[PDB]
Structures are given as structure tokens and as C-alpha cells.
Amino acid sequence: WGGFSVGNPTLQRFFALHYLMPFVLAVFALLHLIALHTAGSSNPLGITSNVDKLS
Amino acid sequence: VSPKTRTSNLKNGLTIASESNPLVQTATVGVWIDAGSRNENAYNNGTAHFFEHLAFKGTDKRSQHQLELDIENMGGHLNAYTSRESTVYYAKSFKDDVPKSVEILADILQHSKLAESAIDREREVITRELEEVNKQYEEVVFDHLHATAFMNQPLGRTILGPRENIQTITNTELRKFITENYTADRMVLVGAGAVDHDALVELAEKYFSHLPSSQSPVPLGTPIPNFVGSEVRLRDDTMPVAHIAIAVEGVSWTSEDYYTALVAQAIIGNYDRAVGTSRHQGSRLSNIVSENNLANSFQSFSTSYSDTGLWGIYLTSENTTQIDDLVHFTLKEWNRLSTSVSNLQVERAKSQLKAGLLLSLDGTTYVAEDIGRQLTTLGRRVTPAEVEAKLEAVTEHDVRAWAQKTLYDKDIALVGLGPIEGLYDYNRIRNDMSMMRW
Ligand code: HEM
Numbered sequence: 001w002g003g004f005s006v007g008n009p010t011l012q013r014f015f016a017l018h019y020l021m022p023f024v025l026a027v028f029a030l031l032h033l034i035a036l037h038t039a040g041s042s043n044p045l046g047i048t049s050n051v052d053k054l055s
Numbered sequence: 056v057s058p059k060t061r062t063s064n065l066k067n068g069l070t071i072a073s074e075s076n077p078l079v080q081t082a083t084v085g086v087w088i089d090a091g092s093r094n095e096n097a098y099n100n101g102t103a104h105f106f107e108h109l110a111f112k113g114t115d116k117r118s119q120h121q122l123e124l125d126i127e128n129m130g131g132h133l134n135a136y137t138s139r140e141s142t143v144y145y146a147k148s149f150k151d152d153v154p155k156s157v158e159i160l161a162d163i164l165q166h167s168k169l170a171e172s173a174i175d176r177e178r179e180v181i182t183r184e185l186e187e188v189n190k191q192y193e194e195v196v197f198d199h200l201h202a203t204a205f206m207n208q209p210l211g212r213t214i215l216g217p218r219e220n221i222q223t224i225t226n227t228e229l230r231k232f233i234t235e236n237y238t239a240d241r242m243v244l245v246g247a248g249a250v251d252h253d254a255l256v257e258l259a260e261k262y263f264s265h266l267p268s269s270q271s272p273v274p275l276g277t278p279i280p281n282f283v284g285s286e287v288r289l290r291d292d293t294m295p296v297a298h299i300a301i302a303v304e305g306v307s308w309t310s311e312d313y314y315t316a317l318v319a320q321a322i323i324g325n326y327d328r329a330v331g332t333s334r335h336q337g338s339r340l341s342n343i344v345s346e347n348n349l350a351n352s353f354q355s356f357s358t359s360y361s362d363t364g365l366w367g368i369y370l371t372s373e374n375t376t377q378i379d380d381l382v383h384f385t386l387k388e389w390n391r392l393s394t395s396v397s398n399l400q401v402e403r404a405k406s407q408l409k410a411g412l413l414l415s416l417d418g419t420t421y422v423a424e425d426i427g428r429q430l431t432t433l434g435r436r437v438t439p440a441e442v443e444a445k446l447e448a449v450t451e452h453d454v455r456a457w458a459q460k461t462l463y464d465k466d467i468a469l470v471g472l473g474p475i476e477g478l479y480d481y482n483r484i485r486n487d488m489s490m491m492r493w
Contacts, residue, residue: 054480055479055480055483
């Protein structure tokens with residue numbers, strides 16, 4: 001809180017973190033795609049798609 | 056300046072066409088027929104090819120064995136081939152063996168036995184041919200290419216025909232085919248090399264005078280094809296070389312754009328890594344392909360028929376991870392026929408073609424094939440002076456205008472055989488038929 005209850009210090013820190021967190025979230029979103037790229041997307045049948053790929 | 060092609064007719068309407076060469080001692084005489092597989096329907100598809108086998112199986116006079124001996128004794132050989140629109144039967148011999156050869160050809164065409172026993176024997180031979188073309192990859196590719204480009208149309212059928220027809224072809228339907236199609240007004244007797252025209256006309260009057268005439272004689276090389284943009288993929292991961300053909304609808308023999316299409320084809324040209332000079336060719340595609348090792352070979356083609364054609368390229372490659380690059384660069388070179396070609400490429404291709412069209416005819420069989428093809432597709436032999444004039448009339452504006460209506464943003468027919476995993480889907484190939492920057 002930066003004090004003894006929710007007040008001005010808490011609001012100002014939540015603003016700075018609320019601005020930051022979406023950039024962190026974008027990095028993790030990119031990380032999970034890079035991790036996925038080793039296997040590729042799964043598909044609704046649950047089988048390999050290595051036999052039949054589309055760009 | 057080559058000797059003049061002499062041309063005479065008989066009364067039935069058989070054309071005789073000859074070109075003498077007093078420097079050679081052999082002669083090629085034969086019969087070019089304006090008829091082929093395209094004249095069959097779906098039920099008798101394969102008949103024309105079946106007949107070609109039976110033509111050499113014995114006549115009313117000479118048996119199979121006597122036929123063999125007669126040709127052996129002549130000293131030369133006989134040859135035949137059936138295509139979609141043309142059948143040829145010729146005999147290469149010595150100068151003074153020409154009357155024998157004309158007589159044998161006249162016999163096998165008019166007076167063939169087509170004996171049920173021989174039909175039944177060949178029916179197995181031809182059945183085995185169905186499982187051995189499989190090896191001739193270029194032919195596999197081009198037959199699938201016609202099948203898909205002219206889907207469900209007569210040009211799309213194969214020459215061998217389906218297995219089912221081979222088992223049901225009778226001597227009746229064979230006889231009917233050759234009676235309807237092998238008529239005098241559709242036939243040309245051709246002699247090239249050591250032949251006298253006047254001698255050949257006499258031999259024609261002796262042997263081919265009792266040929267049927269058709270009821271309605273149309274001119275030689277008289278034919279609607281509806282091209283289908285489409286693809287056939289015959290993936291085979293065990294093959295080391297990919298074979299790919301890409302084509303658009305091209306031009307007929309009598310198109311006004313016939314020479315423009317040949318010039319455009321010459322701008323792309325051919326390439327083969329095994330030939331020493333190919334790394335130094337002027338063609339842009341040749342330079343891209345050779346520098347980047349994209350292919351073992353490519354061959355541009357412009358096939359014509361009476362009422363349509365296919366214009367395109369045939370590629371072979373071992374580079375299985377760069378098939379995409381090979382196809383991409385090929386189609387971007389086609390785009391440039393629409394967007395970029397100038398007098399520089401056009402004049403270079405015309406130079407190369409003016410010689411090429413003459414160079415091709417370097418033996419009596421090639422000359423005979425040229426006379427026969429021209430007479431059965433155009434109705435006349437076109438003199439080199441006329442050909443030189445038609446080539447000269449092709450400008451860069453003509454090439455660009457032709458490419459813009461024939462290639463640019465058009466549907467393609469595409470066949471891939473072998474390790475073609477890297478060949479992208481139809482849309483991505485067809486999207487290379489235009490350039491977003493233009
Ligand atoms: C900002 C949030 C996210 C974005 C922009 C995002 C984006 C994507 C994209 C574009 C793909 C590939 C296409 C697709 O399958 O839809 C994907 C796949 C996947 N995502 Fe997400 N994602 C996000 C959040 C999440 C979350 C919260 C999870 C798991 C709890 C998750 C797990 C996965 C998995 C497992 C796959 C692979 C699914 C497959 O193709 O079989 N993602 N994501």
C-alpha cells in the first residue's frame with residue numbers, strides 16, 4: 001500500500017505497474033509461441049499434422 | 056537456301072509432299088495422318104494406339120513373319136507413333152528401296168488383318184505397358200498435365216486408354232476407327248532425302264489410289280477446349296528427384312500469337328546442369344537457377360494443338376528444401392514477360408529462334424517430320440522466308456501484350472511428382488502469377 005490503507009501511494013504505484021504489466025504479458029505471450037513452434041499447433045483430431053500442412 | 060518442297064494431290068485427295076536432298080543416300084517416306092487419340096470417345100479410348108500395334112502384326116498377303124522378313128530384306132526400318140492429334144507411319148530406307156517401302160506402308164494401312172488371335176495377344180502386351188510408363192517420369196508428368204488441364208475433355212485422355220478398354224477392344228471397333236479416320240483427305244504421303252517427287256506421285260497412284268474419301272472434306276489441320284486451373288500431386292518420398300510441370304493455356308497452330316508465344320518461351324529458355332555451356336546462358340531464370348543450385352534442369356515448352364495449346368515449363372530438382380524458391384523464381388520470371396521485357400530480351404530471343412527453327416531439321420527424318428507436321432496442321436509447308444518474316448514481326452509490345460492476356464494473373468495447371476512436400480498449395484503457387492509491386 002505504501003501506507004496504512006489504500007490511498008494515494010497505492011494508486012500511483014498501481015498506475016506504474018498497470019502500465020508495465022501488459023509489456024511483460026506481451027513478452028510471455030511471445031515466449032509461449034516460441035515454445036509452441038517446436039511441436040507446431042495441435043489440431044482437433046489429436047493426431048500428427050506432419051503428414052498434411054498448410055501455410 | 057534449302058530446296059523447294061513440292062506438293063501434289065491425287066484424285067481421292069491424298070496429298071504428296073516431298074523435299075529432295077541430292078547429297079544424301081537414304082530416304083524417309085511415310086504417311087502423316089491428321090487423326091489420333093483425340094478422335095476416340097470414352098468407350099474406344101486406346102483404339103488408335105491399339106491399331107499401331109496391329110499394323111505390324113500381319114496383312115492379308117504377308118503374315119507377321121513375312122512382314123518382318125520383307126523389311127529386313129529392304130535393309131532400313133519402319134517406325135510409327137500415335138499422338139493426340141497425329142499419327143505417323145514411316146520407312147527409312149536406301150535411295151532405291153523407296154518403292155518397296157511405299158508398298159509395305161500402303162499394305163499395313165489399307166489391308167491389315169486385325170485377326171482376333173492377334174488382338175488377344177496384344178491385349179496383354181498393352182496391359183503391361185500400363186505398368187511401365189510409370190518409370191518415364193517426364194511422360195507421367197505430361198500425361199497428368201493434359202488430364203487435369205483439359206479435365207473430362209478429349210484432349211485430357213491418355214493415348215493408351217484405360218485398362219477396361221484394352222480388355223474390350225474388338226477388331227470391329229478397330230476397323231471402324233481406321234475406316235472413319237484414315238481417309239485420303241486427312242493423309243499426307245511425305246518423302247524426304249533421296250526421293251524424286253514425280254516417282255513418289257506415281258507410287259502414290261499405284262498404292263494409295265483406292266483410299267476412301269471422307270463425306271465432308273474439311274481442310275488439313277481443322278479441329279471447344281475449356282482449360283481447368285488445377286493441380287495433381289503425386290508425392291513419392293522415395294524418389295530423389297522432383298518433377299514439376301506448370302502450364303497455362305497456350306496457342307493453337309494457327310493462332311496469330313503462335314510466334315509471339317515461341318519468342319516468349321525462348322526468353323525463359325532451357326537449362327541443364329550437365330551441359331557445360333548452361334551456366335553461361337543469357338536467360339535470367341537460367342542464371343538464378345544455376346547460381347543457387349535450384350534445379351538439375353528446366354525446359355520451357357509451347358505445345359500446340361488444332362484449337363488450343365499448353366505453354367509452360369518442366370522442372371527437375373533434387374533440392375527438396377528449395378522447391379519453393381525454384382517455383383517462386385520461375386513464376387517471377389514469367390511475370391517479367393508482362394511487366395519488364397524490352398527490346399533487349401525480345402531481339403536476343405528472335406536471333407536465337409531464327410537459327411533454331413532451321414537447325415532442328417538436320418536429317419531426312421527430321422525434314423519428313425517437319426513437312427508432315429506442317430502439312431497436317433497448317434495445310435501447307437511454310438517457307439523459311441515466311442517464317443523469318445513472321446518472327447521479325449514480333450515486337451516487345453507483342454510479347455508484353457501476349458503475356459498480359461495469357462500469363463498474367465491466370466490459372467495454371469500444375470503437376471508435381473516425387474519428393475514435393477516443399478511444393479506449396481495451389482493458392483501460393485497461383486499468387487506468384489502476378490506481382491503486387493506492379
Ligand atoms: C495474451 C494471451 C495470449 C495470447 C495472445 C495467446 C496467443 C496464442 C496463439 C496465437 C496461439 C497459436 C494459435 C492458437 O492455437 O490459437 C496460441 C497457442 C496456445 N496457447 Fe496461447 N495465447 C495467450 C494466452 C494463453 C494462455 C493463458 C494459455 C494457457 C493457459 C495458452 C496456452 C496456449 C497453448 C497450449 C497453445 C497451443 C495450442 C495448440 O495449438 O494446440 N495461451 N496462443
